[PDB]
Structures are given as C-alpha cells and as structure tokens.
Amino acid sequence: GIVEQCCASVCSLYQLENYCN
Amino acid sequence: GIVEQCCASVCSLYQLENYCN
Amino acid sequence: WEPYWPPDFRDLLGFMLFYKEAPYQNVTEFDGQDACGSNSWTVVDIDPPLRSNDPKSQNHPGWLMRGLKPWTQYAIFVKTLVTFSDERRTYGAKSDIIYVQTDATTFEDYLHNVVFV
Amino acid sequence: PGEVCPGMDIRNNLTRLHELENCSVIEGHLQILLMFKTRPEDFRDLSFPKLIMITDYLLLFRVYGLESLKDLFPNLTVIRGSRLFFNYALVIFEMVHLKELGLYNLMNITRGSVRIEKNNELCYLATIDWSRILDSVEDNHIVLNKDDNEECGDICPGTAKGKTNCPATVINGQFVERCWTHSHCQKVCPTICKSHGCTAEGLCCHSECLGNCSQPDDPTKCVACRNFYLDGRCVETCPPPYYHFQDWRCVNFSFCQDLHHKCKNSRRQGCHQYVIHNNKCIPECPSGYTMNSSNLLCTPCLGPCPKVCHLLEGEKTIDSVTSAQELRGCTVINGSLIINIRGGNNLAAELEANLGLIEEISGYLKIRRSYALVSLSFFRKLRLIRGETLEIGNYSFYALDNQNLRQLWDWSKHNLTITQGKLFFHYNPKLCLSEIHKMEEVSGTKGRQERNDIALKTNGDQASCENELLKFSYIRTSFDKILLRWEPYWPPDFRDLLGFMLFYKEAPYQNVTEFDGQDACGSNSWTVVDIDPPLRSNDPKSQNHPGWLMRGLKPWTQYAIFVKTLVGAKSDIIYVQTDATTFEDYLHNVVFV
Amino acid sequence: DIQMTQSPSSLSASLGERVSLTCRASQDIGGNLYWLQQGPDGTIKRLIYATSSLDSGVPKRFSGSRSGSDYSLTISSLESEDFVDYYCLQYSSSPWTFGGGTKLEIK
Amino acid sequence: HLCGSHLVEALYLVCGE
Amino acid sequence: HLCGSHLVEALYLVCGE
Ligand SMILES: *[C@@H]1O[C@H](CO[C@@H]2O[C@@H](C)[C@@H](O)[C@@H](O)[C@@H]2O)[C@@H](O[C@@H]2O[C@H](CO)[C@@H](O)[C@H](O)[C@H]2NC(C)=O)[C@H](O)[C@H]1NC(C)=O
Ligand SMILES: *[C@@H]1O[C@H](CO[C@@H]2O[C@@H](C)[C@@H](O)[C@@H](O)[C@@H]2O)[C@@H](O)[C@H](O)[C@H]1NC(C)=O
C-alpha cells in the first residue's frame, strides 16, 4: 500500500511517481 | 548495512543521521 | 548458446538447461541419481527456436535464470532433447559444464558498509 | 423518472461529472475527488436536480472551489448505505472551500454513519439535527471544521427573522433552529410520520414512502421508497414475476439474465454472473447452492458444491503433490494446466485425490517431461477441454517426452470432449498410436477437419502393443497358495528368450486392469514376480511350461492374475480364488463350541 | 470518540454537605474511568482510578460509583479545600476523553 | 520524510495534472 | 535518491564534524 510504502515507511522519489493518475 | 539501507534501498533523512561519527 | 540443427534440419524440438549451486570443479551429469523424485539438478525445458530464414538464422536459444543467491558459483550446461534419428541415430549435442558466479558487492560497496557503522 | 446509473469515481477534471446529468438513482457509490484547479465559477452553473438517491455512499475529498452542495445535489433525499466506505454512508473530507453542506432535501441515511472532517471553511453543521436523518448518531465523526472554533455566524432566519421560520429541536437542554443554509430550513415531520416523510402541511406520506412525497398517503407519490420500487410505485415486496435487486428495485427475469450473460473474460471485478435465489437476483449463489444453468436458479448441492478455480495468468504448472494440492476441490479450471511430474510416491492416488474432481479445463492441457506418469486416469472426472486458450501452434492437448506413459484414459469407460484446437504427441515411447487414435475418435478431434502434429516414429516405438496371447496350461489352489503354468513364448527367431512377469492382486469381482492406479515408481497397485526364462530341452516336447508358486495368499480370497513377456505376449486376467473351509469343517467348528 | 458528558458544570454547596457529580459515557467504557481534581494553582491530581478505587493519600470522604452508564464522584462531607474543579476521564478506548468539568463553589 | 495530508500534496507537486 | 560516492557526501552534509 501507498501508506505502507511512504508513511509507515519511506518511498523513493520515483516509487512516488509511478502511479500518478 | 548502510549500502543496503540507502543504496539498494532508500533511507529516511533520520535513519541517515543516527550513526554519524 | 549455439542453435542445434540435425542432418535433415527439419522438426527441431527442445533444449534442456541444468544448473546447480556448485563449489569448485567436482560436478558431473550423472550426479547423485536424479532417477524419479528427489533431484540433484535444477532443470529447465527450453522451447526450440524459430529459424527466421537461412541468412542470419542464429536466433540463439537462451534462458534467464532467476532465483539465484548472490556471490554464488553455478554449474550450468545445456543438452538437446533425445531424438530417434533416421538411419545412423543421434540425439545431438550437449554443452560443456561452465561455472558461472552471480555478482557480489563492489569493492567500493564493501568499503562503505565497513567505513560507515 | 430518469436513468439508473452505476457507481462513479470522478477525479482531476469536472468533464466526466456530466455523465450524471440524467440520473434519478445512482446504483452504487459516488466519489468526487482530487480537483485542484477548480474554482467557484466552475460550479455556479452546475446542477444535478434529478438525483434523488444513492444506494451506497457519497464521498467528497479535496474538491477545490466548491462552496456548497445546494446547487449540485438539491434533491438528494436518501443515501441507503447498502455498501459503505469504512462504516460511513457520507464522507466530506478536506473540502477546502466548502462553507455549508446545503443538502436540504436529505431526509434519511438508511445505514451507516457520517464523517465530516478537516473542512476549514465549513459551517451550518451545528444547525443540522442528524437524529432526524440517522437512527444512530453515536458513530458520527464531525470534527476539525470551521464550526469547531468561534467563527461560524450560522443564521437560519431570513424572511421575517426570528418570527415563525425554521423548526427548532433540542440538543441537550437548548433549542436550536435547524437549517442547512441561510435560505433553507431542515424539514421536520410529526412523530406519527416516522421515516415516511410528510407534505408541507404536515400530512403523512404513505408507509411505503421514505423521506418525502408529493401527496399524502399515496404509494405512487413518494420521492423514494422504504422497501422496493416498481413502475412508479413503492411496494413492500416485489410481486410476481419480479425479483428483488440491489435491495431497492424490482426487476424481471430477462434483466437478471442479461447481467448474467457471458462477461467473456473479466471474472476479477467485472462479471459475477447473476443468479436467482429466494426471489432475489443476486451476484452469486449462497453457500450450499449451485447454479442450475438453464434457468439461473440456485439449487442445493448434491453433496459438496462445485468449485471454479481461476489460475494466475491463466496457467499453472503441476510438478509435485504440493502444487496439485493447491487445486484440491476444483471441479472447473479457468485456465490451462501443465503437468511436469518427475518423481515421488503413491502419485496416482495423491493426484487423483487433488485433481480427480476436475470436470472441465477452459484452456489447454499439456503433459511434458512427466517421467513418473504411466496414466492420465488420475484426472477421473475430466470430460471437457474447451481450448479457449491454446499452446503455440494451436494445441489444446499436448503430450511431449513422457517416457513411461502407457495410458491416456481407459477409452472403454471414459468420455472426453475437446471443443477447439489440435493434438500434439511426440516422444511418448510407451504409448501406442491406437490409444492416440482412440482419443481422436472419442474427443471429436475428427479426421474430416484439420491436422494434429502426431509423430508416427516417436509414439509407442518402445512398446509392443498387446499382440500375442499367453494361455494358462495349469492352475492349482491351496488355502494359502496358487500354482500356475502357462504357454512358453517363442519369438520369430526363437533364440535368446529372457523373462516372464507375473502379476497378482487381491481382487473383488471384474473391475481390474493392467494400467491400474499408476504403479509408476514406488507405492504399487500390483504384486509382481520376475520369472526366469525356462530351458527348452530339445525340439520334440519342449513345453517345459513356465510357472510359479504363489505363496503368502489369504484363504478364501479372489486374486486377479496375469502374465506378461519381458519387453510379445500377455495372458488374460484370470481370477483365482484360494481355498476356504470344507462344508464338513464349517459344521464341526459350529456344532462343537 | 467516546463523549464523556459531565454534569452539573457548576455546583454550590456548604461545608459538611454531601455532593455528587456525574459523567455519562456515550459508549460503554466498562470500569475504565479516572476522577481528577485541579487546584486553583493548576495542579492536577488523580483521586479515583478504575471507577471506584481511591488513590493513596486521598481522604476517605471521596468515593466513586457506577450505575448504568452513569459514573459518579461523591464527597460525603465537604471541607474548604474541596471547593475546586473536578474532571472525569475515560481510558477504555484509543482517543482518551475528558468530561467538561465541574466547578464546586461555596454557597 | 513523507506522511499524512502531505503525501497528497507531495503527489500533486510531482503530478501537476 | 541516495547512492555511490554521494552517500559519503550526503553524510557529511548532515555530520558537519
Ligand atoms: C567435492 O569435493 C569436496 C572436497 O574435495 C576436494 O575439493 C573440491 C572442491 C574438488 O576440487 C575435489 O576434486 C577435491 O577432492 C567434498 O567436500 C566435503 O564437503 C563436506 C560438506 O560438509 C565436508 O564435511 C567434507 O569435509 C568435505 N570433504 C573434503 C575432503 O574436503 C565434496 O564431497 C565433493 N563433492 C562431490 C560431489 O564430489
Ligand atoms: C442524457 O441523455 C442525453 C440524450 O441523448 C440524446 O439522444 C440520443 C438518443 C442521441 O440522439 C444523442 O445524440 C442525444 O444527445 C445524452 O446526450 C446525455 O449524454 C445523457 N447523459 C449522460 C449520462 O451523459
């Protein structure tokens, strides 16, 4: 999950991009 | 490892601090 | 690896790739009886390639091994599927055992982890 | 009066929002979110006055420029909450610019709670009496809005100001006037009206109405229904020949049938295949039921229910007992199977336990390098391969390099149909072409049509198929033993005769075969003896008939027995029953304590 | 969020009088309620834990009780030092919440 | 690092739709 | 994001020993 990828974690500036709708 | 924490990964601006000698 | 073509090049069907985690030297085909069940060799069935004419038909059969441990030596070899041939019978060709070691850490990267807690 | 629309998810731009322009009812949810460039002007001339009801939930998140919902959804009366967003039927979150809700026609939220949070300009919240709209307000979460601070100047009075205007209700001890905006009061009906609604004059709507009506005590004049809707009327239950659908409307068989029909692929969120059960048209049969195909009707299962297994990427490779187990209970495979079994123990039984219930495979079946298999009979119930997907070269059944395969299925008993695609057989050394040819006949991979890449030289080349018959010249029973003799076998050049093989198992009646419960490698279905070739002893009287003495047999037990010549001739299956008690000796033991 | 409704918000009484303050829980909180006392200097002190258990040092004239969803603090015989502020607090569920307070004043 | 309401913001910095 | 020779640099930005 995005919460799990960047909040209860840290997400790469690209990981963050990818699924931008 | 620090390589594994920030290179083959992404490390939090704090994770990065912690063990600064 | 090389494409295999029997005398009458017609109906080429299959390759077989074998790989195991190996130390040094001491590796053989007829190793620890594969028989039926518990196996001594990791095995892949490789579909025969599509020739795409006579001039430049080396659309070299290959394989992507995944699920390998890093900094690990692998005994690897290919074989052509066992063919009952017309007249003087031949299955064909097997490659030699090559050892291939997966990548490990860059020196630079060993240093880092060491030099920085 | 207008359309029933499906649930929608509107983001980024207002463009797709106009898809709601003719909906009276949204059968699903409505989410409007993430519109960062919108401004008040974009909403000034935007209205959906036809929308009366949402069956699930309404969610609004980060929609910029929107200051009120009074013009967008002026007539939204009921949110049913059949499906909820995390227990909420109404969600208003981070609506920067929203000054009031203004849903002045919202009378009932049938199920679920309200979550209104982090709306920095939001007022006209203290003025709403939610106890008129929801049965329980205990789970409402209305926090972090402008209303939390000392800045809301909520004003209901406008016409005369403070002289006979909005209805007032109590919070704890304080009476509060109740309104949605400066120009719209909250509708409050007499208690006798319950949730049915009332006219402006205070006259109760009909008991089948929900929230509001145009005329009192008339079930054809409701704005919305308490129970079900049919032909401009609110009804308690759907009358024949109609079915209850999505817990709010009556539909006919044909409608349910249209939904059901063949949503070709999209099994994973985009099909369901609707069924009939207890006068409801529903997404799927409940537990204990299965669907009678010709009339969409759920019927109780004869024993355990059929089970459709959808494979990841449309395929699965079975290379072990463990992988086969993942299909235990399946009766239908949606996808294709690849069998790659090289070894193990008691495989025929284990494979039959896990794969024996499969009746249909929608794609193809491929058996390849399955060294361990002697038969495919473990696929006990397999009757159909559709070939909706095929192996490259348009094959629906493919058998390659199976070194011990001697049987496909027993074609005297088994029927298998192959709708589409071709057959492929190469490098099956123990499989006779007769078995393959029988399969073509049975399966309808008919010889009037197109090819099947079947090798003449690499199928059965290491097998002599049945050919000659060995006959038993002598049979002798003992209670514990059986002594047999049988014809000597001599090939064309009689030279170097080496071996016979005698098979015997404890058998009941008739139902015994050679290619039974895959002997393969390990746990066996047959007791076997290797019989050394005899010594001829010249030409005149050379019948020094090979034989064998079976010992270790149970008494009064039937034995299936047959002989074979090492890979010529096999004998037929004879049943031999070991001796039992003499009548005299049954008598004694009975007649003397 | 569990809402704790504290009543009365203010109370006038005299020395030696018996008084009760109530907190009603919007959801069942079982026995997980504290009673807090705030001095005019701002110091907060806990008097009751687990609805009825008196903390060490607290005079025995203080008692806590429960009836339905009503949790009560009772001062059996008021002393001059008791004319201060009181707050209930629930710890039964994740957002800890407080009653609105009662100021006890001299009649 | 990234969290709460900020993720939504962080994303529109990168999105700009 | 962070890597190679840059980690060493990244670290001294934060260290400043
Ligand atoms: C492979 O041989 C090793 C050791 O033998 C030598 O080293 C090899 C790398 C190769 O060069 C051989 O020709 C040499 O003779 C055997 O290793 C044993 O491994 C177990 C592992 O726990 C260990 O306990 C033993 O001490 C090792 N034996 C020795 C003599 O070192 C291994 O069995 C050989 N394997 C095969 C398949 O031949
Ligand atoms: C609302 O209904 C409108 C009706 O469409 C009109 O009639 C059809 C049969 C065609 O002639 C069409 O060209 C006309 O515009 C739609 O235009 C409109 O898109 C519908 N609302 C939605 C859901 O967008």
Ligand 2 pocket: which of D10, D16, D17, D22 to mutate (most atoms <8 Å of CB)? D22
Torsional sign, CA C22, C26, C30, C32 = negative
Q: Name the percent of chain A in helix, strand, coil, to the closest 5.
A: 25, 0, 75
Atom 2 of ligand 2 has which residue's CA nearest to it? D22
D409, D377 contact by CB (below 8 A): yes
The CA-based angle D459-D461-D464, given to 5 degrees, is 115
Q: Does F10 touch chain A (CB under 8 A)?
A: yes
Hey, which residues does E24 pair with through a beta bridge?
E5, E70
E73, E88 contact by CB (below 8 A): yes
Indicate which ligand has the atom closest to the C-alpha of D4: 2
Please give the CATH number for the structural domain made up of E1-107: 2.60.40.10
Is C116 within 8 Å of G7 when comparing Cβ atoms?
A: yes
CA-atom Rg of chain B in angstroms: 8
Nearest of D189, D122, D121, D184 to residue D157 by alpha carbon: D184
> How far is G5 from chain C, CA to nearest CA, in Å?
9
Q: Which residue in chain D is spatially nearest to C86 when comparing CA positions?
A: D457
The CA-based angle D469-D475-D478, given to 5 degrees, is 150
C-alpha torsion D443→D446→D449→D453, nearest 10 = 70
Verify whether ligand 2 is closer than 6 Å to residue D19 (CB atom). yes
Q: What order do you get walking across the sheet with D280-282 strand by strand? A: D233-235, D228-230, D249-251, D243-245, D280-282, D275-277, D297-300, D289-292
Q: Burial code of F1-17, b = ≥16 C-beta within 10 A, e = fewer?
A: ebeeeebeebbeeeeee
CA distance D307 to D358: 9
Which DSSP letter does residue D572 get?
Answer: P
Q: Is F7 helix (H, G, I), strand (E, B) or coil?
A: helix
Atom 13 of ligand 1 has which residue's CA nearest to it? C26
Q: Is E86 helix (H, G, I), strand (E, B) or coil?
A: strand
Nearest of D51, D50, D170, D58 to residue D109 by alpha carbon: D58
Nearest of D194, D199, D193, D230 to residue D213 by alpha carbon: D199
Six-digit token string for D253: 């068989």
Is C36 within 8 Å of D461 when comparing Cβ atoms?
A: no
Q: Which residue has the tokens 């009939």?
A: D276
Residue type, B4: E
D401, D425 contact by CB (below 8 A): no
CA distance D286 to D143: 40
Residue type, C16: M
Spell out the domain ranges in chain E: 1-107
Atom 22 of ligand 2 has which residue's CA nearest to it? D19
Cα-based distances in Å from D98 to D76, D117, D205, D408, D452? 18, 11, 33, 71, 69
Ligand 1 pocket: which of C21, C26, C34 to mutate (most atoms <8 Å of CB)? C26
Verify whether ligand 1 is closer than 6 Å to residue C26 (CB atom). yes
CA distance C95 to E66: 85
Verify whether ligand 1 is closer than 6 Å to residue C30 (CB atom). no
Indicate which ligand has the atom closest to the C-alpha of C99: 1
Per DSSP bridges, beta strands D58-63 and D88-93 are: parallel
Cα-based distances in Å from D321 to B12, D242, D410? 45, 49, 23
Q: What are phi and psi of D499, to 5 degrees?
A: 105, 145
Indicate which ligand has the atom closest to the C-alpha of D19: 2
Q: How many CB atoms lie within 10 A of CB D19?
A: 12
Question: Which residues lie below 8 Å from residue E68, measured CB to CB, with a gap of 6+?
Answer: none
**Ligand 2 centre from D13 Cα, in Å?**
20
How many residues are present in chain A?
21
H-type alpha helices, D202-251: none
Q: Is D443 helix (H, G, I), strand (E, B) or coil?
A: helix
Question: Where are the extended beta strands (E) located within D507-590?
Answer: 527-531, 547-550, 558-565, 569-571, 574-577
CA distance D195 to C50: 73
Cα-based distances in Å from C23 to C26, C38, C74? 8, 20, 8
Nearest of D521, D505, D502 to residue D565 by alpha carbon: D502
CA D52 to chain centre: 35
Which DSSP letter does residue D459 get?
Answer: B
Question: Where are the extended beta strands (E) located within D340-429?
Answer: 360-361, 365-368, 384-385, 395-400, 417-418, 422-426
CA distance D328 to D321: 11
Q: Does F5 touch chain D (CB under 8 A)?
A: yes
D56, D84 contact by CB (below 8 A): yes
Is C112 within 8 Å of G11 when comparing Cβ atoms?
A: no
Verify whether ligand 2 is closer than 6 Å to residue D21 (CB atom). yes
DSSP states along D132-176 = GT-S--TT-EEESSGGGSS--------SSSSSS-S--EESSS-EE
Question: Where are the extended beta strands (E) located within D456-508?
Answer: 468-470, 472-477, 482-486, 500-506
Q: Name the percent of chain E in helix, strand, coil, to the closest 5.
A: 5, 50, 45
Is G7 within 8 Å of B10 when comparing Cβ atoms?
A: no
CA distance D237 to E86: 56
**Ligand 2 centre from E79 Cα, in Å?**
80
CA distance F11 to D195: 44
**Ligand 1 centre from D426 Cα, in Å?**
41
DSSP states along C4-67 = ---SS------EEEEEEE--SS---TT-S---SSS-SSEEEEEPPP---SSTT----------S
> How far is F11 from chain D, CA to nearest CA, in Å?
11
Residues of D in contact with E5 (CB under 8 A): 172
Six-digit token string for E62: 């203080």
Which DSSP letter does residue D355 get?
Answer: H
Nearest of D153, D101, D103, D91 to residue D122 by alpha carbon: D101
CA distance D427 to D405: 10
**Own/partner pairs, D223-230, CB within 8 angstroms, 24+ separation:** D223/D52, D223/D75, D223/D77, D223/D197, D224/D52, D224/D53, D224/D77, D224/D78, D224/D108, D226/D195, D226/D196
Question: Which residues lie below 8 Å from residue C50, measured CB to CB, with a gap of 6+?
Answer: C59
Q: Does G8 touch chain B (CB under 8 A)?
A: no
Residues of C in contact with B17 (CB under 8 A): none
Q: Is D194 helix (H, G, I), strand (E, B) or coil?
A: coil
C75, C97 contact by CB (below 8 A): yes
Q: Does A15 touch chain B (CB under 8 A)?
A: yes
Q: Does G1 touch chain A (CB under 8 A)?
A: yes
CA D230 to chain centre: 32
DSSP states along E43-63 = -EEEEEETTTEEPTT--TTEE
Which DSSP letter does residue A11 get?
Answer: -
Cα-based distances in Å from D491 to D390, D503, D536? 45, 22, 13
Residue type, E30: G
Helix (H) or strand (E) holding D257: helix D253-260
Torsional sign, CA D287, D292, D295, D296 = positive
Q: Is D381 helix (H, G, I), strand (E, B) or coil?
A: coil
CB pairs under 8 A between A and G: 3
Which of B7, B10, B20 comes nearest G15 by C-beta? B20
Q: Does F14 touch chain D (CB under 8 A)?
A: no
> How far is C85 from chain D, CA to nearest CA, in Å?
9
Torsional sign, CA D96, D124, D200, D196 = positive
B interface test, pick of C71, C107, C109, C115 with most B CB neighbours within 10 Å:
C109
D15, D34 contact by CB (below 8 A): no
What is the experimental resolution, given in Å to one decimal place? 4.4
CA distance D579 to E79: 108
Hey, which residues does D292 pair with through a beta bridge?
D297
Hey, which residues does C100 pair with through a beta bridge?
C74
CA distance D206 to D248: 17
Q: Which residue has the tokens 């603090």?
A: E73
Question: In chain B, what is the greatest distance between 2 CA atoms, to the nearest angstrom?
Answer: 22
Peptide bond into D219 cis (omega under 30): no
Q: What are phi and psi of D250, to 5 degrees?
A: -100, 130
**Ligand 2 centre from D228 Cα, in Å?**
28
CA distance C14 to C4: 9
CA distance D519 to D506: 15
Hey, which residues does D276 pair with through a beta bridge?
D281, D297
CA E100 to chain centre: 10
CA distance E7 to E24: 8
CA distance D291 to G2: 57
DSSP states along D265-283 = S--SSS----EEETTEEES
**Ligand 1 centre from C27 Cα, in Å?**
11
Atom 15 of ligand 1 has which residue's CA nearest to it? C26
**Ligand 2 centre from D22 Cα, in Å?**
9
**Ligand 1 centre from D374 Cα, in Å?**
38
Is C39 within 8 Å of D342 when comparing Cβ atoms?
A: yes
Question: Which residues lie below 8 Å from residue B5, measured CB to CB, with a gap of 6+?
Answer: B11, B15
Peptide bond into D533 cis (omega under 30): no
Q: Which residue has the tokens 């995944």?
A: C66
Helix (H) or strand (E) holding D437: helix D433-443
Ligand 2 pocket: which of D21, D26, D51 to mutate (most atoms <8 Å of CB)? D21
Cα-based distances in Å from D45 to A13, D34, D42, D72? 40, 20, 7, 9
Verify whether ligand 1 is closer than 6 Å to residue C28 (CB atom). no
**Ligand 2 centre from D24 Cα, in Å?**
15
Indicate which ligand has the atom closest to the C-alpha of C27: 1
